[PDB]
Design a protein around this ligand. Structure first.
Ligand code: JBK
Ligand code: JBK
Lengths: 214, 207
């Protein structure tokens, strides 16, 4: 049973993942995802969420007073606060597993050059805070990362889904297609040989594509 | 200029792009290329195993219509080469990206094999986590690439006003106006952060 709250200045970005949730899981109260417009917590008629960086630099920094108010309202002491950031610890499948048992995740999506560091530092004095990165590529903001994290975590939550080495190639019908035959070993009925063939394909593909895994 | 076509059995999920764009991005329902009226796109794997594999026939017909010889065909897959910022720079000058989003247990390998006989094909992973399909990966790839289209160390902490908030001060050096001291402090924060969070970037063992 997980509640995920996402806070973002582009709530529209997160709406399809909300609607993508299986009806059965929602009706069974297994999962709920709520998306919040950060500007709900702005102080001024211009709905300002950012300001210039102390010490100079490019772009803007998201305001701590706005974020502080948002998180005060949404978080409790039991919340796991997730802050996507290119400067985070790596988000891995082990991370997803660990988070899949949580009662409450709050995902704070940043933009511009990030969120004033005191927001996370203050939050960390009364709840668990995790700054994480989903990869070594540069995004404009945290929403795409939130989407990846939500998908990876929720498919591990018991119910939501319904009812090493790289994977090698897979095949299905037809047995011959555009001059290419399914490897005959797969149609052999020799299931120990099939498993050995798959193991070797995995080893080859891992060596070629992901030598770091070895 | 760049055209991106995304092929998926969940086109409604790609709508986070059409909000985020002033390049052209078009999304295609894979089932438009089925002839059966169950609109079936998958079947059990040869050789056995759990789940289903997407049939090559439907994909072949879709890609036949959408791709040309100059197309860069991108196939997100947990079994891909890593998609990195270097990849994003490389792809930022392409005229035409087609992103083939798999579901179930992936796409019959012959789809990529056949495509590679007439265009360039790149199977890539955005990370070592398990997604339900390639659509979220497509969104990440599109965002990383589009921001680079013409037209080391972790980043340290950032701060803005007010200089004191809930009794927490912005590090005084950042208010000093001393550019050399600020650069030095930022370099040191970045060093600490990278060693702690991403030692691999500096050539050390991961925990
Ligand atoms: N990489 C990145 C980014 O550039 C911006 C926000 C979040 C992330 N991330 O989670 O990896
Ligand atoms: N990791 C993953 C996946 O589980 C499914 C499709 C694509 C990816 N990926 O690009 O990393």
């Amino acid at each position: 049973s997980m509640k995920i709250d996402v806070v973002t200045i582009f709530p529209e970005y997160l709406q399809p993942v909300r609607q993508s949730l299986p009806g059965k899981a929602i009706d069974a109260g297994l999962v709920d995802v709520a998306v919040h417009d950060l500007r709900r917590w702005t102080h001024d008629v211009h709905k300002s969420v950012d300001d210039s960086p102390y010490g100079g630099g490019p772009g803007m920094v998201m305001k701590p007073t706005v974020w502080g108010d948002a998180l005060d309202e949404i978080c409790t002491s039991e919340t796991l606060l997730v802050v996507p950031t290119p400067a985070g610890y790596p988000f891995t499948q082990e991370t997803a597993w660990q988070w899949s048992t949580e009662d409450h995740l709050v995902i704070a999506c940043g933009r511009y050059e990030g969120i004033d560091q005191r927001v996370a530092d203050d939050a960390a004095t009364r709840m668990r805070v995790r700054e994480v990165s989903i990869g070594d590529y540069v995004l404009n903001g945290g929403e795409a990362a939130a989407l990846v994290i939500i998908e990876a975590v929720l498919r591990l939550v018991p119910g939501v889904l319904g009812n090493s080495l790289l994977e090698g190639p897979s095949y299905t019908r037809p047995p011959s297609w555009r001059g290419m035959d399914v490897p005959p070993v797969l149609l052999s009925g020799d299931h120990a040989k099939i498993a050995a063939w798959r193991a070797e394909q995995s080893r080859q593909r891992t060596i070629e594509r992901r030598p770091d895994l070895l």
